[PDB]
Design a protein around this ligand. Sequence first.
Ligand SMILES: [Mg+2]
Ligand SMILES: [Mg+2]
Ligand SMILES: [Mg+2]
Ligand SMILES: [Mg+2]
Ligand SMILES: [Mg+2]
Ligand SMILES: [Mg+2]
Lengths: 348, 274, 113, 115, 104, 64
Amino acid sequence: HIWSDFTTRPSSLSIQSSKVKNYLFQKKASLDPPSISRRSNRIKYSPPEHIDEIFRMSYDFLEQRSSKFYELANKTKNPLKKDALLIKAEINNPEVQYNFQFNNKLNNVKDIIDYDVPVYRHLGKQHWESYGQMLLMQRLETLAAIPDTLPTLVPRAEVNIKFPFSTGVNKWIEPGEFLSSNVTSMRPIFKIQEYELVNVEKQLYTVLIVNPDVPDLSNDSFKTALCYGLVNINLTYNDNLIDPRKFHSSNIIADYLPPVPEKNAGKQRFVVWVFRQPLIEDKQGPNMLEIDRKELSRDDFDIRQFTKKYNLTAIGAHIWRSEWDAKVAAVREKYGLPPGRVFSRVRR
Amino acid sequence: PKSACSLVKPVHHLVKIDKSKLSPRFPELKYDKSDIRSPGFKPKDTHADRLNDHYLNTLQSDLLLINYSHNAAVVKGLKQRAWSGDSPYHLNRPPKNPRGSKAQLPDIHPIKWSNIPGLESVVINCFVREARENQLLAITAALQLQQITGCKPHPIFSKNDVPTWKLRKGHQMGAKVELKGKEMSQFLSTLTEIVLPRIREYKGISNQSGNRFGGISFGLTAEDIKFFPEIDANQDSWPKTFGMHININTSAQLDYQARTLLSGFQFPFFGEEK
Amino acid sequence: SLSPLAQRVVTQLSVMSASRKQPKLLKLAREDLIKHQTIEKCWSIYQQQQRERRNLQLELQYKSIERSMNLLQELSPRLFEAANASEKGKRFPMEMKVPTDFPPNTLWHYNFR
Amino acid sequence: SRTSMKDSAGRRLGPKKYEGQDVSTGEIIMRQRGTKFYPGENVGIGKDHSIFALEPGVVRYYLDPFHPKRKFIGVALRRDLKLPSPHFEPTVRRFGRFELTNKRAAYKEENSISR
Amino acid sequence: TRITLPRRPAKKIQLGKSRPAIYHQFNVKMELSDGSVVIRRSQYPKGEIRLIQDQRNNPLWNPSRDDLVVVDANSGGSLDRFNKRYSSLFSTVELSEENKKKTQ
Amino acid sequence: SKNSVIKLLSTAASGYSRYISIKKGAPLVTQVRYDPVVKRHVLFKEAKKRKVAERKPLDFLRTA
RNA sequence: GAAAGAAUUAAAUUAAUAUAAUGGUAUAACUGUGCGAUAAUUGUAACACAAACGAGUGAAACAAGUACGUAAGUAUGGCA
RNA sequence: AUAUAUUUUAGUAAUAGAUAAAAAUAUGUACAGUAAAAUUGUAAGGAAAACAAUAAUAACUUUCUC
Ligand SMILES: [Mg+2]
Ligand SMILES: [Mg+2]
Ligand SMILES: [Mg+2]
Ligand SMILES: [Mg+2]
Ligand SMILES: [Mg+2]
Ligand SMILES: [Mg+2]
């Protein structure tokens, strides 16, 4: 009975509600489902017949298998194999499945879904790959964010963004969404959830928001501008919400300037890229890097050259879109930017 | 429409996109048909299956031993021939047809522990030619199939226009059904145990029957269909009954292996084999 | 206005149809859904183990066949050719019947021919 | 008898704009029955499968590895650009518009909005 | 000249709402000629049935057995009356009396 | 010959109309299209009264 | 060693295309399906092809409104 | 088990699959798939009715197992 043990197993591998635990592990069909709040509906409900003893036997079978997996995990040495065996051991646990399926996975509570645990990390990876990653890749491809900015993307982390300071309402921005100048006036906050084995004590991350659509009349084309940039940021599996609480001015290589499109200048795309820095060995402590701020262009940016020079690998991305409206002038005045240009209605 | 020009734009990533997951529409079709949350859910394993258990317990080993051939090798089938490059006109010339056939034929691998023959499906064909004048006989035939087998019948509709037979096109001439697993096991068991023994003069199945790559077909008449339990129980509701063809599709690489397998399932054979 | 044959076939196709015969959709609580998921995972794993045990037994049997064939080939070619002779026309005995779920009156027959 | 002297005048099909030639928006590059030449980039295709440039540039005939057994006609935004452009390289785009330096024009455009 | 019953407007069964077909069946017991019994699924409301002629009493399926009696339906037709009508002659005397004809 | 002409008139009392052909016995035509006078999509019905063919209503709530 | 996926390769446009013949079409333009029946709408149409004229053909872009789509977008009748 | 008042069931009707080359909606959009001949068989069935079978798995995943 290893699943009943919690000496070394994290406490999150159990259903924190006594009622639901007792109902799920009940001996006779005398209790009632806590999910059904109204008694009336509880009396109406009728569970499938002959379901608790088959459940007990299936539990015993799966638990024996998990015990064997734990036995082999306690002896494996390679961290990757250790993590894989832990996942295989706890994947089939009804309590883990309950917790993940029916509790929040984005604003997770450490005592229900702990991303320090391999099984929860793996289930979260699967959930993200099911819906979130596909939508992200579709939006990037269709809006042409990949080739314009960076050659490709192999998603390995979930990136969510929000604009809490601007207005006061709470909303995670859907990728490719159109946002008002008022909405995107102040600053974005990020949430970078990692699902792979990464050394939290050594790894550092950078985040760059760029706009590859700012018009350039010298050659009658577009160019890229570095809207926002942070370097030397450390995350954790359960504490990975980047905000002005979790970084200093030394991490800021380019303070945030808002989306300020020009009239008839087209729909501009603001793309967020998250990179992880190199991970040098034989050295203690995070490997911080200094950005050449007298070389950083900030208005004629070259992201491919930047990442090549600093040996960065992208692991996540996001995107939103902006276009002119009435509040752009107010934002320009508030940020001390020159009055906006006005371009023709026809593309000739 | 400005144009009719299909063209798929290339992508810049290796992530496979399935739009059925990005569309909020059809929430209940996102579940697999095996998922208890799917309205298409139907319990599969409700009871043990005598025929399958017998085949797994006894016939697999015997068939392996019987079909063993020492140091055997794959026999490649008739494939499309290639033009020798002795003439420039052969550069982009499509390949030639197989020597004796207009269609390519499969290769035959030696029987090994992983590819022992076994039953994969059964299909029953009921084409009531007299339904050309009466469309209700098709419904009766479908009910006959449903009662005999227990699966949902599927209608058969005329496709060709033959005047001599007075067969038009687009009319319902009968019904078909495909059986797998326990249901086909039951159908074959009841056939062998009840119906075939009750035929007047039954010697078995012809040894020169079946498509040359595994699969045995044989027919039954109306009087033969009358022997099934459901029809005999309520003769009153069966003034007329229809015959049907029965096609047993197996995993056999060749026909004689399938014949041995069916003989194991107790299907007699009488004719001289090819 | 319909014929009695029409009524008979309409009844037959009523037996066909699903109208006014299916029960309500099966809606299960979250806890029972999890229970069912565990049941199915257990059964799937179990059937996979059974299948693999059978496959391993057949692998071992085939290895035995080939080892025996090699030995017999090198020991006596006559017996090896007799063994390797094909059984293309082989059929199973007609009383090697599929097991039933309750035995017959005469369990075994002690006389033949 | 019944004399056979009925025929239709030759449809003036064929390439109407040759490789290396400079083209403007809307100009017809090819007239064809069906798609013997598919459209590449910076070019569109009409009802009768007429290829026409969507941007000013230079006409190039080429073949694309992504679409074997398919000829393509497209428009390069500069002479010095090979048209089967690298896949993982940012797309070349033409802004096209011009800034309204005139105060009155800028005012009108600023105050013009949709219905 | 053909007879068909009219088609009514088919009810639309939406995508995802299409359920499977589970016809009502009974766990019926089926007795063969011998004492053996097989459980099967049947749609007829008859939980029990026995067979008089079946696999277990057919020469083709039963070659090894020496003796095998055959039988048909009872209380139907004029079967067995060709014997019930003649009681004076009864079963080996006839076999002996059928020795030869002595005709040429 | 086999096809006749019809004047569809807009529902908004603006006087706008558009003309279309139709078969001799086709069901009465009505269609939503742009009405420049009111600057929106509005309904267009027949102007005159036409001899339309009679088609049986469908057996929908089961009869007899 | 074995299952279930994802699919890849060869071949195929000979079937099918509302209708002749030709060109095109599997990446489908062919076929099935859910919404829908909407773009088989409105005011300017550059520029080309073709061209004696008169006519004909493709169509970018601006503006008004619709239907479908998660989105990208598609639709100003029908593969030509 | 009888008697009545009220109510419920029975109008008994095909697709149960995003169906896919039997017949039916010839214009829009979104999702998805691949035909045809020929060969081998199969109650009536034959040249010709309807069903079934007919190219290759090296590489990549998840699972089970030695
Ligand atoms: Mg001509
Ligand atoms: Mg057409
Ligand atoms: Mg053609
Ligand atoms: Mg000219
Ligand atoms: Mg002119
Ligand atoms: Mg079309």
